Amino acid sequence: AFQETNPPAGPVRAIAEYERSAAVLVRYPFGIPMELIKELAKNDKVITIVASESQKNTVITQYTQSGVNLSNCDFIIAKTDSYWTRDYTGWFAMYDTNKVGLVDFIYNRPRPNDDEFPKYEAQYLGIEMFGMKLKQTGGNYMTDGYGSAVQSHIAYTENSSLSQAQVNQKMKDYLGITHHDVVQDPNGEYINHVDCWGKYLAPNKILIRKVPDNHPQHQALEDMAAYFAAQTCAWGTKYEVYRALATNEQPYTNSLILNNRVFVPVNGPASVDNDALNVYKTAMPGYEIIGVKGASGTPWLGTDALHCRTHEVADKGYLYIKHYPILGEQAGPDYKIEADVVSCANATISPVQCYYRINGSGSFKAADMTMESTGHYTYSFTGLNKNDKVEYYISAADNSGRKETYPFIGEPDPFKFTCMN
Ligand code: NA
């Protein structure tokens, strides 16, 4: 059964989908097209859940026949009731300064093998599992990686024996969430997953579904988009709100961000798909945006598509860069950057650099950041002139062979600010 545990030793920080992923978790019998599994396995580890050695051999034959990169295919043998790995698998969080853990919860649907599955996931990854006593659904959860999470109103109505404050406190204790944004549902739907209408694309970017003016959800979604555009995000700027127009219930927000690739389910028409992919491409410079057609037997649905049938897996040895950027004309008066870098592999970190460029001229220059205290690195931009334009990003490496940048995509989309002092 679900086993409640004490919460993880603090501080805790839930890991966002756009942070480094060591793998992606899918399930057999499949709910996704083989073409998607082949694309995933080209660059990333694909973990497939199977119920037996027999099913594992069936899957290996299908992957071989389809030309899947078998060197990137791993398996977990466990019973499951469904292929909605988004919804019942564990949630990832960093805790105890430099550990990666899994958070289990009471799955909100009567599928006991799905509900039990996180134990097998933690065992496979060799990480600790914590049991947060809330009725939850992964499809209805997203975090920005800076302590905010968005969920539909189901997060309170399915935990109605607790007060909202008790629900928020569990999210704080197990996932480090300091703003549990459970948004109102004016239509009070029986099922309402945030990934059907909203998606953080970055700490400062959110995609909100848009529908035609006469659709019954038109005003509710316009209100949601205005709510996010009017408020401050983790980086101190307003959210950038992007809109994916669903003319006919296309699940365009139900995408998967996996490292530098974004897999977007597409159902047509082709012009409306192209418009939606161009919103993702505009929102996420440097990323590879891939439209993915559905499998004929298990097609994408408006309320259930690619994000619902995948789950990114964090890196147990994550080389994590925590940084709040200095941006625009609001970067001063102190043009000093700070980055906290920790190795969850307990590896030796070296080097920690600021790569920067002035007025878009020449190659990026690397400067070693000063380690003022353990895990705390700084760099001051000096000798700049009024109205100079800066691009910069953070780079770190460790002796486990990990290499990371902040932002994740690195040099293709660095942080930008203007010298106003
Ligand atoms: Na569970």
Short mmCIF file of N, CA and C in Angstrom, two decimals, residues 321-324 326 335-341 349-356 365-373 375-381 392-396 404 406:
data_model
loop_
_atom_site.label_atom_id
_atom_site.label_comp_id
_atom_site.label_asym_id
_atom_site.label_seq_id
_atom_site.Cartn_x
_atom_site.Cartn_y
_atom_site.Cartn_z
N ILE A 321 22.98 23.54 -10.81
CA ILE A 321 23.28 24.96 -10.76
C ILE A 321 22.04 25.70 -10.39
N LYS A 322 22.08 26.35 -9.22
CA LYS A 322 20.99 27.22 -8.75
C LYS A 322 21.39 28.66 -9.06
N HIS A 323 20.62 29.38 -9.88
CA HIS A 323 20.97 30.74 -10.24
C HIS A 323 19.73 31.53 -10.52
N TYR A 324 19.69 32.75 -9.98
CA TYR A 324 18.68 33.75 -10.33
C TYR A 324 19.38 34.75 -11.22
N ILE A 326 20.43 38.00 -13.71
CA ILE A 326 20.28 39.45 -13.74
C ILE A 326 19.83 39.76 -15.20
N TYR A 335 25.74 44.60 -10.46
CA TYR A 335 25.86 43.65 -11.58
C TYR A 335 26.77 42.46 -11.18
N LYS A 336 26.40 41.83 -10.09
CA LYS A 336 27.08 40.68 -9.54
C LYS A 336 26.16 39.49 -9.68
N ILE A 337 26.71 38.39 -10.16
CA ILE A 337 25.92 37.17 -10.29
C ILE A 337 26.40 36.18 -9.26
N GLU A 338 25.49 35.32 -8.82
CA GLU A 338 25.79 34.27 -7.84
C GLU A 338 25.20 32.98 -8.35
N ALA A 339 25.91 31.87 -8.16
CA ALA A 339 25.37 30.56 -8.52
C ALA A 339 25.81 29.59 -7.46
N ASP A 340 24.87 28.79 -6.95
CA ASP A 340 25.17 27.72 -6.01
C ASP A 340 25.23 26.46 -6.82
N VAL A 341 26.35 25.74 -6.72
CA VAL A 341 26.53 24.53 -7.53
C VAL A 341 26.81 23.38 -6.57
N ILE A 349 33.74 19.32 -7.99
CA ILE A 349 33.32 20.28 -9.00
C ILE A 349 34.49 21.14 -9.45
N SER A 350 34.69 21.22 -10.77
CA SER A 350 35.74 22.04 -11.38
C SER A 350 35.68 21.89 -12.89
N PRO A 351 35.62 23.01 -13.63
CA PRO A 351 35.56 24.40 -13.16
C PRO A 351 34.11 24.92 -13.04
N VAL A 352 33.93 26.11 -12.42
CA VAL A 352 32.63 26.84 -12.39
C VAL A 352 32.91 28.17 -13.06
N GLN A 353 32.32 28.37 -14.23
CA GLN A 353 32.61 29.52 -15.04
C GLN A 353 31.41 30.32 -15.44
N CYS A 354 31.67 31.59 -15.68
CA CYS A 354 30.73 32.50 -16.30
C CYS A 354 31.23 32.72 -17.69
N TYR A 355 30.41 32.36 -18.67
CA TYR A 355 30.71 32.60 -20.08
C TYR A 355 29.94 33.83 -20.44
N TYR A 356 30.60 34.83 -20.97
CA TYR A 356 29.90 36.07 -21.25
C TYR A 356 30.40 36.71 -22.52
N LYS A 365 33.59 34.61 -23.65
CA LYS A 365 34.78 34.59 -22.80
C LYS A 365 34.45 33.85 -21.52
N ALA A 366 35.35 33.00 -21.06
CA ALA A 366 35.15 32.25 -19.84
C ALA A 366 35.91 32.88 -18.70
N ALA A 367 35.22 33.06 -17.57
CA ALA A 367 35.82 33.60 -16.36
C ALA A 367 35.50 32.67 -15.22
N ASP A 368 36.50 32.30 -14.45
CA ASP A 368 36.25 31.46 -13.30
C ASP A 368 35.48 32.26 -12.27
N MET A 369 34.42 31.66 -11.74
CA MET A 369 33.67 32.31 -10.68
C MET A 369 34.41 32.10 -9.38
N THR A 370 34.31 33.04 -8.46
CA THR A 370 35.01 32.92 -7.19
C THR A 370 34.16 32.13 -6.21
N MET A 371 34.74 31.09 -5.59
CA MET A 371 33.98 30.32 -4.61
C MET A 371 34.12 31.03 -3.27
N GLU A 372 33.15 31.88 -2.94
CA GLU A 372 33.25 32.69 -1.72
C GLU A 372 33.05 31.83 -0.45
N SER A 373 32.21 30.79 -0.54
CA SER A 373 31.98 29.76 0.49
C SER A 373 31.65 28.48 -0.26
N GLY A 375 30.25 25.69 -2.29
CA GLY A 375 29.10 25.59 -3.17
C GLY A 375 28.51 26.91 -3.62
N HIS A 376 29.12 28.07 -3.23
CA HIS A 376 28.60 29.41 -3.56
C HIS A 376 29.63 30.17 -4.39
N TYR A 377 29.29 30.42 -5.66
CA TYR A 377 30.19 31.00 -6.63
C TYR A 377 29.68 32.33 -7.09
N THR A 378 30.58 33.31 -7.23
CA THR A 378 30.15 34.64 -7.67
C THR A 378 31.00 35.18 -8.80
N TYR A 379 30.48 36.19 -9.50
CA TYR A 379 31.21 36.89 -10.55
C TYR A 379 30.65 38.29 -10.68
N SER A 380 31.53 39.30 -10.74
CA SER A 380 31.05 40.67 -10.89
C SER A 380 31.43 41.17 -12.25
N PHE A 381 30.45 41.72 -13.00
CA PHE A 381 30.72 42.33 -14.27
C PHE A 381 31.30 43.69 -13.96
N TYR A 392 25.17 36.22 -20.96
CA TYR A 392 26.02 35.36 -20.17
C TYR A 392 25.30 34.07 -19.84
N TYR A 393 26.07 33.07 -19.43
CA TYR A 393 25.51 31.84 -18.92
C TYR A 393 26.52 31.21 -17.95
N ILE A 394 26.06 30.30 -17.11
CA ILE A 394 26.88 29.60 -16.13
C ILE A 394 27.25 28.23 -16.67
N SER A 395 28.48 27.80 -16.44
CA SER A 395 28.91 26.47 -16.87
C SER A 395 29.62 25.78 -15.72
N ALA A 396 29.32 24.50 -15.51
CA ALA A 396 30.00 23.73 -14.45
C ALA A 396 30.28 22.34 -14.93
N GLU A 404 27.18 20.82 -17.08
CA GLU A 404 25.89 21.48 -17.09
C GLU A 404 26.02 22.96 -17.30
N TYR A 406 23.62 26.79 -16.96
CA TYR A 406 22.39 27.49 -16.62
C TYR A 406 22.36 28.76 -17.49
#
